[PDB]
Swiss-Prot record:
This is Sulfiredoxin-1. Keywords: Antioxidant, ATP-binding, Cytoplasm, Disulfide bond, Magnesium, Methylation, Nucleotide-binding, Oxidoreductase, Phosphoprotein. It catalyses: S-hydroxy-S-oxy-L-cysteinyl-[peroxiredoxin] + [protein]-dithiol + ATP = S-hydroxy-L-cysteinyl-[peroxiredoxin] + [protein]-disulfide + ADP + phosphate. Its EC number is 1.8.98.2. The gene is SRXN1. GO terms for biological process: cellular response to oxidative stress; response to oxidative stress. It is found in: Cytoplasm. InterPro entries: ParB/Sulfiredoxin_dom, ParB/Sulfiredoxin_sf, Sulfiredoxin. Its main location: cytoplasm. Widely expressed with highest levels in kidney, lung, spleen and thymus. Contributes to oxidative stress resistance by reducing cysteine-sulfinic acid formed under exposure to oxidants in the peroxiredoxins PRDX1, PRDX2, PRDX3 and PRDX4. Does not act on PRDX5 or PRDX6. May catalyze the reduction in a multi-step process by acting both as a specific phosphotransferase and a thioltransferase. Belongs to the sulfiredoxin family. It comes from Homo sapiens (Human). ATP binds at residues 82-85.
Length: 121
């Protein structure tokens, strides 16, 4: 749980390209991925990816993922794409998946779900 926090000490949100920020590749757990948009997966195309990760996990780049926080610091990870890439990782029963984190705002989520957008907390 986390019924407490530090405090304000740096305008991170709306920060210009000189304030402070760290965006890089990160292994985000598969159990905390948010995907509210089903898709049609192909069993032959997943096999090709499952073969790359099993034959060479270095020639496989990360996917783009949006990093947004709720009204209570609750971090939520949204993914839109790499659908087939998720099946290969999910099929290999792996614990986490490489994904590029990109700080975003609830507005960016409205562009994708400007209708079924929930209330993050
Ligand atoms: N054996 C392989 N089979 C298919 N794609 C491969 C293979 N090895 C490398 N790749 C790369 O994996 C990437 C697959 O993910 P990408 O995000 O690019 O596109 P996508 O097919 O639209 O699907 P999703 O968003 O569902 O993963 C491709 O860009 C391709 O270049
Ligand atoms: Mg495409």
């Amino acid at each position: 749980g986390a019924p407490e926090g530090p405090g304000p000490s740096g305008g991170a949100q709306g920060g210009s390209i000189h304030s402070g920020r760290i965006a890089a590749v990160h292994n985000v757990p598969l159990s905390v991925l948010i995907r509210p948009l089903p898709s049609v997966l192909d069993p032959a195309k997943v096999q090709s990816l499952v073969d790359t990760i099993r034959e060479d996990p270095d020639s496989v780049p990360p996917i783009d993922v949006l990093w947004i926080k709720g009204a209570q610091g609750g971090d939520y990870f949204y993914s839109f794409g790499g659908c087939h890439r998720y099946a290969a990782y999910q099929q290999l029963q792996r614990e986490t998946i490489p994904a590029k984190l990109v700080q975003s705002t609830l507005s960016d989520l409205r562009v994708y779900l400007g209708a079924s957008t929930p209330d993050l907390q």
